[PDB]
Design a protein around this motif. Structure first.
Motif, PDB file in Angstrom:
ATOM      1  N   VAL A   5       0.842  -1.203   0.000  1.00 57.26           N
ATOM      2  CA  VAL A   5       0.000   0.000   0.000  1.00 57.26           C
ATOM      3  C   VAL A   5       0.873   1.249   0.000  1.00 57.26           C
ATOM      4  O   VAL A   5       1.981   1.247   0.551  1.00 57.26           O
ATOM      5  CB  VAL A   5      -0.964   0.014   1.201  1.00 57.26           C
ATOM      6  N   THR A   6       0.394   2.293  -0.664  1.00 58.08           N
ATOM      7  CA  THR A   6       0.954   3.623  -0.508  1.00 58.08           C
ATOM      8  C   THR A   6       0.203   4.281   0.637  1.00 58.08           C
ATOM      9  O   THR A   6      -1.034   4.239   0.690  1.00 58.08           O
ATOM     10  CB  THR A   6       0.803   4.416  -1.783  1.00 58.08           C
ATOM     11  N   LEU A   7       0.947   4.889   1.555  1.00 59.71           N
ATOM     12  CA  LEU A   7       0.353   5.529   2.722  1.00 59.71           C
ATOM     13  C   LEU A   7       0.530   7.043   2.672  1.00 59.71           C
ATOM     14  O   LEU A   7       1.537   7.543   2.171  1.00 59.71           O
ATOM     15  CB  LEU A   7       0.953   4.964   4.000  1.00 59.71           C
ATOM     16  N   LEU A   8      -0.454   7.767   3.195  1.00 58.92           N
ATOM     17  CA  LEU A   8      -0.386   9.222   3.257  1.00 58.92           C
ATOM     18  C   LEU A   8      -0.350   9.712   4.701  1.00 58.92           C
ATOM     19  O   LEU A   8       0.105   9.000   5.596  1.00 58.92           O
ATOM     20  CB  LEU A   8      -1.578   9.874   2.533  1.00 58.92           C
ATOM     21  N   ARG A   9      -0.830  10.931   4.919  1.00 54.94           N
ATOM     22  CA  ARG A   9      -0.238  11.823   5.910  1.00 54.94           C
ATOM     23  C   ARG A   9      -1.260  12.830   6.425  1.00 54.94           C
ATOM     24  O   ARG A   9      -1.067  13.443   7.475  1.00 54.94           O
ATOM     25  CB  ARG A   9       0.968  12.539   5.324  1.00 54.94           C
ATOM     26  N   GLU A  18      -1.301   0.368  -6.374  1.00 57.46           N
ATOM     27  CA  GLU A  18      -1.975   0.178  -7.679  1.00 57.46           C
ATOM     28  C   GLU A  18      -2.454   1.513  -8.295  1.00 57.46           C
ATOM     29  O   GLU A  18      -2.019   1.891  -9.392  1.00 57.46           O
ATOM     30  CB  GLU A  18      -3.169  -0.814  -7.531  1.00 57.46           C
ATOM     31  N   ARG A  19      -3.313   2.221  -7.556  1.00 55.50           N
ATOM     32  CA  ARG A  19      -4.015   3.398  -8.060  1.00 55.50           C
ATOM     33  C   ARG A  19      -3.399   4.760  -7.659  1.00 55.50           C
ATOM     34  O   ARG A  19      -3.770   5.806  -8.205  1.00 55.50           O
ATOM     35  CB  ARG A  19      -5.516   3.304  -7.733  1.00 55.50           C
ATOM     36  N   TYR A  20      -2.455   4.727  -6.722  1.00 51.97           N
ATOM     37  CA  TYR A  20      -1.577   5.861  -6.429  1.00 51.97           C
ATOM     38  C   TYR A  20      -0.645   6.152  -7.598  1.00 51.97           C
ATOM     39  O   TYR A  20      -0.361   7.303  -7.874  1.00 51.97           O
ATOM     40  CB  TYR A  20      -0.724   5.580  -5.186  1.00 51.97           C
ATOM     41  N   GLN A  21      -0.135   5.125  -8.262  1.00 52.35           N
ATOM     42  CA  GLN A  21       0.766   5.369  -9.393  1.00 52.35           C
ATOM     43  C   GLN A  21      -0.009   5.640 -10.699  1.00 52.35           C
ATOM     44  O   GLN A  21       0.525   6.240 -11.632  1.00 52.35           O
ATOM     45  CB  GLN A  21       1.805   4.217  -9.555  1.00 52.35           C
ATOM     46  N   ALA A  22      -1.267   5.201 -10.747  1.00 46.46           N
ATOM     47  CA  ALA A  22      -2.197   5.627 -11.805  1.00 46.46           C
ATOM     48  C   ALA A  22      -2.565   7.106 -11.632  1.00 46.46           C
ATOM     49  O   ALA A  22      -2.603   7.854 -12.612  1.00 46.46           O
ATOM     50  CB  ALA A  22      -3.470   4.761 -11.825  1.00 46.46           C
ATOM     51  N   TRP A  23      -2.831   7.509 -10.390  1.00 45.67           N
ATOM     52  CA  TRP A  23      -3.060   8.893 -10.062  1.00 45.67           C
ATOM     53  C   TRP A  23      -1.943   9.801 -10.560  1.00 45.67           C
ATOM     54  O   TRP A  23      -2.218  10.901 -11.073  1.00 45.67           O
ATOM     55  CB  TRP A  23      -3.142   9.068  -8.555  1.00 45.67           C
TER      56      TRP A  23
END
Ligand SMILES: [Ca+2]
Ligand SMILES: [Ca+2]
Ligand SMILES: [Cl-]
Ligand SMILES: [Cl-]
Ligand SMILES: [Cl-]
Ligand SMILES: [Mg+2]
Ligand SMILES: [Mg+2]
Ligand SMILES: [Mg+2]
Ligand SMILES: [Mg+2]
Ligand SMILES: [Mg+2]
Ligand SMILES: [Mg+2]
Ligand SMILES: [Mg+2]
Ligand SMILES: [Mg+2]
Ligand SMILES: [Mg+2]
Ligand SMILES: [Mg+2]
Ligand code: NA
Length: 212
Positions: A5-9, A18-23
């Motif tokens: 997972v990509t995590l934020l802040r 998956e969809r963080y790098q599509a973003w």
RNA sequence: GGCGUUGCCGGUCUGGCAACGCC
């Protein structure tokens, strides 16, 4: 996108890598097209970017997504547009200097900005070449147009809005009392307040105003 | 194509369309 997972802040925020790098994939495309078509514009308006690709996710998360990418040295952020890291509008080198100097004149002048008239005299500029440069500074969000002859630097406007919030916190205020608060004069403060009415920051009632 | 001007639109402008100018 996504949960909370990509995590934020932002209080944390999983988004499926998956969809963080599509973003970010789309963001690069949009911005390349835009810079490519608009070499004399500072970048894609923020709300255009959001509405286009991010209406889905909430405003305060979108902020953080921009905030992080700038931090990674991927985006250059302005008060009201986004651009890619090494984007450079193609003005002449003389015009690049003029953009620096226009900004400075407005910053230093603060709550008592010159008129456009004065500026054009003192920079020795066609109304039309001046319009191009003022316009880009306005797209970018560095200057804000108060009325046909007064622009304000954004820091000066931001600081006068705090002054107005302080003033209004003790109740409805008059034009004279706002002029006192800014240690300015009626020539400058009247246009400021009329401007703030129009954007619905203050609201006018007889001779008095409040902060909405 | 951009960028400016003018005109027109939609209450409005960090606009849209068209003509003209320069690029
Ligand atoms: Ca920029
Ligand atoms: Ca700038
Ligand atoms: Cl901002
Ligand atoms: Cl502002
Ligand atoms: Cl506020
Ligand atoms: Mg556009
Ligand atoms: Mg202040
Ligand atoms: Mg008013
Ligand atoms: Mg006004
Ligand atoms: Mg266009
Ligand atoms: Mg006009
Ligand atoms: Mg008209
Ligand atoms: Mg009609
Ligand atoms: Mg325009
Ligand atoms: Mg022709
Ligand atoms: Na172009």
């Amino acid at each position: 996108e996504g949960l909370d997972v990509t995590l934020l802040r932002v209080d944390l925020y999983a988004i499926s890598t998956e969809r963080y790098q599509a973003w970010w994939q789309a963001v690069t495309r949009a911005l390349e097209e835009f810079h490519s078509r608009y070499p004399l514009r500072p970048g894609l308006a923020r709300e255009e970017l959001r509405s286009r690709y991010f209406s889905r996710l909430p405003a305060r998360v979108y902020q953080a997504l921009l905030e992080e990418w700038s931090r990674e040295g991927r985006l250059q952020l302005a008060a009201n547009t986004v651009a890619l890291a090494g984007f450079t509008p193609s003005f002449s080198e003389t015009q690049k200097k003029l953009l620096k100097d226009l900004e400075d004149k407005y910053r230093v002048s603060r709550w008592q900005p010159p008129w456009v008239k004065e500026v054009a005299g003192s920079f020795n500029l066609d109304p039309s070449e001046l319009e191009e440069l003022l316009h880009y500074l306005v797209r970018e969000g560095v200057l804000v147009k108060i009325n046909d002859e007064f622009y304000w630097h954004r820091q000066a406007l931001g600081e006068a809005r705090e002054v107005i919030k302080n003033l209004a916190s003790t109740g409805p205020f008059g034009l004279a009392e706002a002029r006192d608060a800014l240690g300015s004069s009626r020539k400058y403060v009247l246009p400021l307040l009329e401007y703030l009415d129009q954007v619905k920051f203050t609201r006018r009632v007889g001779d008095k105003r409040v902060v909405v």
